[PDB]
Design an enzyme around this catalytic site. Structure first.
Site, PDB file in Angstrom:
ATOM      1  N   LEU A   1       4.544   8.253 -12.545  1.00  0.00           N
ATOM      2  CA  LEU A   1       5.232   9.981 -13.268  1.00  0.00           C
ATOM      3  C   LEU A   1       5.054  10.873 -12.420  1.00  0.00           C
ATOM      4  O   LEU A   1       4.139  11.917 -12.243  1.00  0.00           O
ATOM      5  CB  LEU A   1       4.274  10.058 -14.459  1.00  0.00           C
TER       6      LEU A   1
ATOM      7  N   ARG B   1      -1.732 -10.528 -28.997  1.00  0.00           N
ATOM      8  CA  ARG B   1      -0.913 -11.148 -30.162  1.00  0.00           C
ATOM      9  C   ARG B   1       0.102 -11.997 -29.215  1.00  0.00           C
ATOM     10  O   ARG B   1       0.928 -13.296 -29.991  1.00  0.00           O
ATOM     11  CB  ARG B   1      -1.173 -10.841 -30.854  1.00  0.00           C
TER      12      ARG B   1
ATOM     13  N   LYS C   1      12.403  28.745 -15.978  1.00  0.00           N
ATOM     14  CA  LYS C   1      12.518  29.331 -17.195  1.00  0.00           C
ATOM     15  C   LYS C   1      13.691  28.768 -17.489  1.00  0.00           C
ATOM     16  O   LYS C   1      14.809  28.109 -16.766  1.00  0.00           O
ATOM     17  CB  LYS C   1      11.857  30.506 -17.359  1.00  0.00           C
TER      18      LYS C   1
ATOM     19  N   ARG D   1       0.721   2.479  -3.043  1.00  0.00           N
ATOM     20  CA  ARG D   1      -0.089   3.415  -3.972  1.00  0.00           C
ATOM     21  C   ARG D   1      -0.499   4.459  -3.520  1.00  0.00           C
ATOM     22  O   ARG D   1      -0.837   5.627  -3.815  1.00  0.00           O
ATOM     23  CB  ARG D   1      -1.176   2.982  -2.381  1.00  0.00           C
TER      24      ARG D   1
ATOM     25  N   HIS E   1       0.233  -0.122 -11.760  1.00  0.00           N
ATOM     26  CA  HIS E   1       1.560  -0.450 -12.458  1.00  0.00           C
ATOM     27  C   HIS E   1       2.284  -2.043 -12.218  1.00  0.00           C
ATOM     28  O   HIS E   1       2.296  -2.619 -12.903  1.00  0.00           O
ATOM     29  CB  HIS E   1       2.428   0.022 -12.756  1.00  0.00           C
TER      30      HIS E   1
ATOM     31  N   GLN F   1       0.223  -1.077  -0.427  1.00  0.00           N
ATOM     32  CA  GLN F   1      -0.432  -0.113   0.256  1.00  0.00           C
ATOM     33  C   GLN F   1       1.134   0.891   0.248  1.00  0.00           C
ATOM     34  O   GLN F   1       0.384   2.396  -0.214  1.00  0.00           O
ATOM     35  CB  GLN F   1      -1.034  -0.043   1.367  1.00  0.00           C
TER      36      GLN F   1
ATOM     37  N   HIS G   1      10.080  15.378 -21.454  1.00  0.00           N
ATOM     38  CA  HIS G   1       9.232  16.614 -20.896  1.00  0.00           C
ATOM     39  C   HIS G   1       9.802  17.400 -20.456  1.00  0.00           C
ATOM     40  O   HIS G   1      10.809  17.362 -19.243  1.00  0.00           O
ATOM     41  CB  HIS G   1       8.163  15.826 -20.621  1.00  0.00           C
TER      42      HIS G   1
ATOM     43  N   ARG H   1       6.664 -15.357 -32.822  1.00  0.00           N
ATOM     44  CA  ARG H   1       6.061 -15.653 -33.619  1.00  0.00           C
ATOM     45  C   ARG H   1       6.748 -14.646 -34.761  1.00  0.00           C
ATOM     46  O   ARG H   1       7.091 -13.528 -35.521  1.00  0.00           O
ATOM     47  CB  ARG H   1       4.494 -15.542 -34.832  1.00  0.00           C
TER      48      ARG H   1
ATOM     49  N   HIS I   1      16.673   2.148  -7.477  1.00  0.00           N
ATOM     50  CA  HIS I   1      15.628   1.736  -6.490  1.00  0.00           C
ATOM     51  C   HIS I   1      15.787  -0.172  -7.367  1.00  0.00           C
ATOM     52  O   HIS I   1      14.076  -0.023  -6.671  1.00  0.00           O
ATOM     53  CB  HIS I   1      14.211   2.698  -7.672  1.00  0.00           C
TER      54      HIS I   1
HETATM   55 FE   LIG Z   1       7.968  -0.996 -14.069  1.00  0.00          FE
END
Ligand SMILES: [Fe+3]
Ligand SMILES: [Fe+3]
Lengths: 445, 439, 439, 417
Positions: C37, C220, C342, C32, C54, C29, C263, C239, C120
């Site tokens: 991001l 697939r 900036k 959580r 995730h 948790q 970004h 495949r 991590h």
């Molecule tokens: Fe991951």
RNA sequence: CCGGCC
RNA sequence: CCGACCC
């Protein structure tokens, strides 16, 4: 003016009045009753599509692909006349085909008139010339900006290819259109690079009318193309971020080719229908120009007769009372009553190809059908189905690169089958014996 | 034997019992391979080239699914094999009697040419099924699988047609206990039926219509209840939304099928061409009989060989009498099509005197007020009456909780498309509309 | 016990009681409340997804990919002991992420403790070890058929890789599983081929929460995968008719990593949050077992403290009235009024990479930023964000044994004035380019 | 300045006027970044992590698009830029008053904490908007861009809540001829508004439920007409199936998400934690005053910092006084939740002592009953076109049957069955 | 079954 | 053209 035709596969297909006038004529509507995918009609229930949707899709795709390339590369200032010529050629994507579609130039005309050298792209070109000469479109072609001396040569070369046979490696044997528009000759019918709108359109249409998973999305491929010089010669090339789309296209092509175009019962019914149509060639005839009874086999010699060569001939055998047409109707009835030719056994030849065109194929097959390889009786009229017919594309150049970005070439002939239907169980044993004999006889297949 | 399976673009795999296969494997049923449901709409709608073979297979599949869902959901019905075989055989007749070009032949062609003969395709389907059973020896196979022809065939014909014959159970093939099975495929009362559902799905698949209808859920949620006084198959689940969008798309593609402008004129031209070519094409029957183009309905042995091919039998015809007729078919191959002179809205019409409708049109179109010349038989007038949502929706009763909430155009397409005559046609249309009864 | 989790991307995710017991612990948790991001939420309003979903998705994908390989290739003897063990390894592949995910070990820890090497993955290993030792997971590991002495080592090696550093090229450095299960180390953490369930799941989640077109479909790829021997070892291969799918996956990866993970304002906000943590590092104490006060940077040394180090610390600075936190709080407030730093300039030098981890990076950049490059005055408060973090390595089956067919971005930021800051940023970008190996 | 654009997964590009940007980039609006939209429903739906910030941005975008379409389509309404900006501002600030865990804070917590004060989050939104304008100096910008604060601000506040006060146009923000602008965003009467569209779309995006309603078509086919006596916005075209599908989406979202049993149990546990920690949590308001969790609604300075973080600020707390509260939070770590004890069907302030009546009936049924009593009742049409849940605190397996029997007896005795 | 609507 | 760069 501007006409628009609604097609289920490519949506709205826009045409200009010259293209419509060529299209909405008697010699194209004949296509409306000749199914593009013929032999699956009694094998794949939904595969009832006709040549109309295939031709419409090919025209739409060619128009979109040539309109995108020229707004995203406005440095050569191409002319509408060239696009009109290419569209005319494209509307012959399958035009030449007669009864049972690709069979006519595939397995009907070459099998019936073996000495006659005829191909359906050249036939399409000739039929288009006949349409022009009869429907009076040339004066309005010159009125609305087309020059037959060069536009007709360009269209004919786009439809058929190299009209003459000049032997020169370091030359351009195409005088129909100047090389400043060489890329325009890889848009409607290209057999070397493999980037052709025809395959796209017929893959999408066959998938739509068969319910098979078609992933390819031609819109992105069209929208991402520019003309780039590759090796001292100009070719239309797409962008790098599309290789998955073309992989999907190739897998759709292979799936369509191996599900339908080589189906077991589909090919068996194709062979039976082709034989029944062929065997009545001379005595169930149509009249051409001058009233001459130029029969179906000989109807390739005149376009007026060739117009009336549609799938109706099939039915014209089924519902005929003439004593000479008896056999044909009988066989068709045995097709309807589910007395089909059941098939067992398959091979592929590795010894180059056959000597004759198709004649000697049957006779050697019948001969090799009988052998003393340990039921009773024997036969000779047993069928022999011979079917003859990883993206290897280097048009990945980038627009920003003037003559580069080939992506290192994207990183990395006949099937013969039998059919024996003597009895419920006797036929299977005889088919096994004949499969042994033919295998030991088919040039050590 | 065991189940066969046929792949269709609409319903995928369609599994059929051996009796259904035996029915399907007949000349009189394989004739349907050349009968387009959308028919004449092909000459204005490209992709709508589907045939009646898949329509019949789909209707059989849908009826089998419906009966199996009813049996599983309600064990109290005690479904047996006779009902299943009879229902499948009746289902596979959803267009069985249709002739050349389907709804064109009886909706516009046969009634126009010879108004004195009663031609409905359900009776033709009954006669064709009787011919199929008699010729193909179906009755021995029906006995072989346990079903009883003497009542199952009557039930199938009634389902194909309707009432068998004092407002007391007109159908005499099944008792009052099977009151819902008679509306699985035909359902002449409610207006939503497996035939319409399946052919809507197939038409929208092959025409570009966006069909949001999910029929499998509707099948899975069917239970038998009471509506007013007797048993009625009611949709257990609340699918009001789904069926709302369903009727929306139905009106969309039903009015798309009844084409406008080019399509209607093309259909009329084809009909008129067949009517002109009736004398110059012969059809062989049984016992050497030769029945003319229109009168071939009186024998099912000859009617088995009636498909769209008669169209081609003019396109490949060389007998001189049909010359003119062939040209009219040519008139729709090439783009020289006639324009329509308008439409209007209106019971005063039946299967009689409709063949004189253009004459009354010729009464107003020619010699109109302040009109000179431009008078001929150009009237090819078309009547398309043929046959919100306002859905009727027809364990201890009191559960059928219903929720809360005509004449076609008088279209006279002028056969002559002369540009000079266009102004005369406009004046004639105005005079005709303001004179007879309409606007 | 059998749990099911609703995920927008993966639908129904089924878990078995070992996975539930691991999930319903305080140290899961914790995930959580950690943003996937960290600095992307202050740029993308939809990017509020946390590491919890995730991790659930990655565990589900790893379980499905290891469950398929063993039903369609039952020669490697995959048992219930292995599938759950994998799933656990996947579910704890990001267990040790700190506040604001990749920022914590990406820019904070090197700035705070340059002498300690922290990633991590090591945090995931330590947090998992603490979870095992504290939550009583060993008894239920043994209950459901596991051997902790080797299974824990196998999972830990799955997360990080070689625990030891043996000097032998031709050796199997894993004590978890022998080479007969080498493919098991190519599911959750892959460094060569790039096909692991972690990347798939977080690409799908970022596409769902960023409104981007997701062309790759892992269903697939899973359904068409087999274990193949490539170079004396077992590798997972797909495949042949999937190379377009993997091209789409790779292009999705590149688009995601050039929109979000590079970004501009996202990285600026990451730098601002990192600076706010740095200024508040000394004045924030977290208490674990025994009452010991570990700061933000040193809380990685104790898992009991590191559990309670989530994104809340951000808010725990913002809603703080303590004067000693003042500066830190101030910077956070400048984030809310959108008084961002900036930025002008983004260059990458060709002289290898940065020497130190994060300490010497800032000082040399600020110092060299001032030079007589043909405004007035000078300053030294200029940050320098250095982020480091094509289909040949992917192998696929050829037909139906087959084989395969045939870096440091540096940016600055000046927030002096509307015009003076821009001029100074241009001057500093010129100076740094002319100085950093002629960048 | 210039027009801004914000990327949203639902509405794509969301273009904002500079005044809207100035309003948004303020602490009292960025506070929504740390308030969950569904709140406790997040701990039941792992994908439902969206906040009120994107909901507010989307509702503002939808309201702006609707008003601009109405203005372009029908010039006889004389819609100007001031009306459009006011509607957008009312859209952005329609949920500023949401507290921790959104609807849990006032639907479940406030009536228990302070039953003597009537508090709905729309009034909180009005007060928060007033504080935003006063603190952040919005009025000079409103004057700059053509708005008239003395009436435009009153109009925005009326759009948020309604009449500030002879059944003759109670609103005082704009004349009675513009009677449709008051139901673009709030729409207390008809029941369809941009707020509902946007939060339905976002819930379906983050829950996996199917979204059938296309709001762009409804906007493009909107006209203002008369039904009975005054101007009313309505769908000129017949998008009846689309609206019915939207209402089906509404019903599905309310039934599955907003009424989940485990969601209500999570909300009840968080509510109990807040009630226990109310006396021992101090929030610095304006002027240095310390406002409790319950009393932070009376001052917007303290209410600005009252977000979901207080949850974590109890979970990681080390003060012994908060111990009990922290322990209750600890339960969610191991998914130890109150069990289900039954359902029954029939003001929140009056029901504050509800459990006592439950303790009146559950005990001595045909104290342990009081302890286990965690009752949280939490209790197209008119459109122009063309239950009781006594969460069992004691999770003892043997006592579960006794608790169930007691709850059944209580329900079948007192007022229900 | 307390993160399924079978 | 600092919650975008081309949807
Ligand atoms: Fe991951
Ligand atoms: Fe809201």
């Amino acid at each position: 003016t501007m006409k628009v035709i609604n097609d289920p596969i490519h949506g709205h297909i826009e045409l200009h009045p010259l293209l419509v006038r060529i299209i909405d004529t008697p010699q194209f509507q004949r296509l409306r009753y000749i199914k593009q995918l013929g032999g699956g009609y009694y094998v794949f229930p939904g595969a009832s599509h006709n040549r109309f949707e295939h031709s419409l899709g090919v025209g739409y795709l060619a128009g979109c692909l040539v309109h995108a390339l020229g707004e995203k590369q406005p440095e050569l200032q191409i002319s509408e006349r060239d696009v009109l010529c290419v569209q005319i050629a494209g509307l012959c994507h399958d035009l030449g085909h007669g009864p049972f579609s690709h069979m006519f130039d595939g397995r009907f005309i070459p099998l019936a008139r073996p000495e006659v050298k005829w191909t359906h792209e050249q036939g399409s070109v000739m039929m288009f010339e006949h349409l022009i000469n009869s429907n009076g479109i040339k004066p309005v072609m010159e009125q609305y900006g087309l020059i037959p001396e060069e536009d007709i040569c360009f269209i004919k070369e786009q439809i058929v290819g190299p009209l003459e046979s000049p032997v020169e490696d370091s030359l351009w044997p195409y005088k129909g259109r100047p090389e400043n528009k060489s890329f325009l000759y890889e848009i409607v019918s290209n057999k070397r690079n493999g980037i052709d709108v025809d395959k796209w359109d017929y893959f999408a249409r066959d998938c739509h009318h068969l319910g098979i998973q078609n992933n390819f999305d031609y819109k992105r491929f069209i929208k991402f193309a520019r003309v780039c010089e590759v090796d001292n010669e100009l070719r239309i090339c797409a962008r790098d971020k599309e290789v998955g789309n073309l992989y999907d296209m190739f897998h759709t092509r292979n799936s369509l080719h191996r599900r339908a175009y080589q189906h077991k019962v589909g090919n068996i019914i194709d062979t039976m229908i082709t034989d029944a149509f062929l065997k009545a060639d001379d005595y169930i005839e149509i009249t051409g120009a001058g009233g001459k009874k130029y029969r179906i086999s000989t109807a390739i010699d005149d376009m007026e007769a060739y117009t009336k060569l549609t799938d109706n001939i099939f039915l014209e055998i089924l519902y005929s009372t003439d004593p000479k047409l008896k056999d044909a109707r009988e066989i068709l009835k045995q097709i309807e009553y589910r007395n089909l030719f059941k098939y067992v056994g398959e091979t592929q030849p590795t010894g180059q190809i056959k000597i004759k065109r198709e004649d000697y194929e049957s006779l050697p097959k019948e001969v090799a059908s009988a052998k003393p390889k340990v039921v009773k009786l024997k036969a000779e009229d047993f069928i022999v189905d011979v079917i003859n017919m990883p993206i290897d594309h280097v048009s990945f150049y980038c627009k920003t690169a003037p003559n580069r970005a080939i992506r290192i070439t994207k990183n990395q002939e006949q099937l013969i089958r039998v059919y024996c239907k003597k009895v419920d169980r006797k036929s299977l044993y005889a088919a096994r014996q004949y499969f042994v004999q033919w295998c030991a006889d088919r040039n050590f297949t």
